Design an enzyme around this catalytic site. Structure first.
Site, mmCIF file in Angstrom:
data_model
loop_
_atom_site.group_PDB
_atom_site.id
_atom_site.type_symbol
_atom_site.label_atom_id
_atom_site.label_comp_id
_atom_site.label_asym_id
_atom_site.label_seq_id
_atom_site.Cartn_x
_atom_site.Cartn_y
_atom_site.Cartn_z
ATOM 1 N N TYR A 84 0.847 -1.187 0.000
ATOM 2 C CA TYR A 84 0.000 0.000 0.000
ATOM 3 C C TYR A 84 0.885 1.240 0.000
ATOM 4 O O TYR A 84 2.032 1.204 0.465
ATOM 5 C CB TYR A 84 -0.954 -0.039 1.223
ATOM 6 C CG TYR A 84 -1.689 1.243 1.560
ATOM 7 C CD1 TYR A 84 -2.952 1.513 1.022
ATOM 8 C CD2 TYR A 84 -1.144 2.167 2.452
ATOM 9 C CE1 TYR A 84 -3.643 2.689 1.348
ATOM 10 C CE2 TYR A 84 -1.814 3.342 2.775
ATOM 11 C CZ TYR A 84 -3.059 3.601 2.225
ATOM 12 O OH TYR A 84 -3.709 4.768 2.546
ATOM 13 N N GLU A 93 -3.619 6.915 -4.115
ATOM 14 C CA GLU A 93 -3.492 5.852 -3.132
ATOM 15 C C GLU A 93 -3.463 4.532 -3.894
ATOM 16 O O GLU A 93 -4.249 4.345 -4.817
ATOM 17 C CB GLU A 93 -4.673 5.919 -2.162
ATOM 18 C CG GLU A 93 -4.630 4.994 -0.966
ATOM 19 C CD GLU A 93 -5.910 5.133 -0.128
ATOM 20 O OE1 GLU A 93 -7.003 5.134 -0.726
ATOM 21 O OE2 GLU A 93 -5.835 5.263 1.108
ATOM 22 N N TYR A 95 -2.710 0.056 -4.061
ATOM 23 C CA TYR A 95 -2.800 -1.248 -3.432
ATOM 24 C C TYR A 95 -2.299 -2.313 -4.401
ATOM 25 O O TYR A 95 -2.665 -2.321 -5.584
ATOM 26 C CB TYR A 95 -4.241 -1.616 -3.085
ATOM 27 C CG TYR A 95 -4.943 -0.849 -1.978
ATOM 28 C CD1 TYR A 95 -5.635 0.332 -2.246
ATOM 29 C CD2 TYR A 95 -4.987 -1.353 -0.683
ATOM 30 C CE1 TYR A 95 -6.314 1.011 -1.242
ATOM 31 C CE2 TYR A 95 -5.662 -0.674 0.327
ATOM 32 C CZ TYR A 95 -6.322 0.498 0.035
ATOM 33 O OH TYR A 95 -6.994 1.160 1.030
ATOM 34 N N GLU A 183 -5.354 -4.001 6.293
ATOM 35 C CA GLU A 183 -6.466 -3.062 6.378
ATOM 36 C C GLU A 183 -7.742 -3.778 6.806
ATOM 37 O O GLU A 183 -8.017 -4.890 6.363
ATOM 38 C CB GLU A 183 -6.724 -2.344 5.040
ATOM 39 C CG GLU A 183 -7.805 -1.287 5.186
ATOM 40 C CD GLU A 183 -7.842 -0.269 4.067
ATOM 41 O OE1 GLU A 183 -8.660 0.660 4.165
ATOM 42 O OE2 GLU A 183 -7.063 -0.371 3.100
HETATM 43 CA CA LIG Z 1 -8.871 3.281 3.840
#
Ligand SMILES: [Ca+2]
Ligand SMILES: [Ca+2]
Ligand SMILES: [Ca+2]
Ligand SMILES: [Ca+2]
Length: 327
Positions: A84, A93, A95, A183
């Site tokens: 991440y 962002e 992943y 997460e």
């Molecule tokens: Ca989040």
């Protein structure tokens, strides 16, 4: 243990605990990149260990990134086990998802696929609207590579995913972070990351070394001369004596292996310069040919002058150079 929002560095790894309100969480920092995590009835929680960057370099300028990991992963609900991170300008962002809980992220229709590290990943781009981010509440893109099947250990060739993304027009900004992450979303769970190693610069052992013979480089300084004993090469006798050559650097990081010797039992020292910057020192402890390796030099891609120079001579030794290998 860590039970509230915290940023720090632990055993060399930039770690971070983040959760919004609701529920609880606990993160225990272990050696290297390793940690254990527990969470109960959260809205959103992230546990991670990796590297934060200063937002000035692209991922190519940082170099090849690879993560080798292993986790015992017990999510009870929506959760991800992923590499991440963030880029800035654009704010992104991202992943690289290897396992998940009850739901395989991120919905929507794939933009492509990549086969790497023995698996298959589908690639997606999504949008978050007025969501928390490293720049406050913001609207930004998310980039995803999601494995078609769960696994909780192996190697993630992070830079391969990055190039696949850029190849599909998912343009990345300067790096802010890369980190192995657990997460949780609207869930509970636990996880033990017992192995987490982030490698910048090195790869495979046969991707192919370049050897440059010292006698084929450009000589400089008052006395630099060829020699045939204890090998075919050159001798650096006085301060300023040097040998140099332009090298075409493909990657941003290299190891430098210099084969040399002192002329006697006194220690000889030879400075390394790349692009006019001192980048380190080779040590030759005695009169017998030996290879001294300076590893993990971040010099950046491009054609740069490599200079091997004597600067600490005092008449008690000479430096003999056979060859320099760049890996
Ligand atoms: Ca989040
Ligand atoms: Ca809830
Ligand atoms: Ca000398
Ligand atoms: Ca040589």
């Amino acid at each position: 243990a860590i039970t509230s929002n915290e940023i720090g560095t632990h055993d060399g790894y930039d770690y971070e605990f983040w959760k919004d309100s609701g529920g609880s969480g606990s993160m225990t920092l272990n050696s290297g990149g390793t940690f254990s995590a527990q969470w109960s009835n959260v809205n959103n929680i992230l546990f991670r260990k990796g590297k934060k960057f200063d937002e000035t370099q692209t991922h190519q300028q940082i170099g090849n990134m690879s993560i080798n990991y292993g986790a015992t992963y017990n999510p009870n609900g929506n959760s991800y086990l992923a590499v991440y991170g963030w880029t800035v300008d654009p704010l992104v962002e991202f992943y690289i998802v290897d396992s998940w809980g009850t739901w395989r992220p991120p919905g929507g229709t794939p933009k492509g696929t990549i086969n790497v590290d023995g698996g298959t990943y589908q690639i997606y781009e999504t949008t978050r609207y007025n969501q928390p981010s490293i720049k406050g509440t913001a609207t930004f893109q998310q980039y995803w590579s999601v494995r078609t099947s769960k696994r909780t250990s192996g190697t993630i060739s992070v830079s391969e995913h990055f190039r696949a993304w850029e190849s599909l027009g998912m343009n990345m900004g300067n790096m802010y972070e890369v980190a192995l992450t657990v997460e949780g979303y609207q869930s509970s769970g636990s996880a033990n990351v017992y192995s987490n190693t982030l490698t910048i610069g090195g790869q495979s052992g046969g991707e192919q070394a370049t050897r440059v013979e010292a006698e084929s480089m450009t000589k400089g300084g008052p006395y630099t001369s060829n020699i045939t004993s204890p090998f075919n090469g050159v001798a650096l006798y006085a301060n300023g004596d040097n040998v140099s050559f332009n090298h075409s650097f493909t990657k941003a990081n290299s190891s430098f292996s210099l084969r040399g010797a002192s002329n006697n039992s006194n220690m000889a020292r030879v400075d390394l310069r790349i692009g006019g910057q001192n980048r380190g020192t080779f040590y030759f402890g005695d009169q017998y040919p030996a290879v001294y390796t300076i590893n993990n030099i971040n010099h950046g891609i491009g054609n740069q002058l490599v200079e091997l120079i004597v600067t600490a001579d005092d008449g008690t030794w000479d430096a003999y150079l056979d060859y320099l290998e760049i890996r």
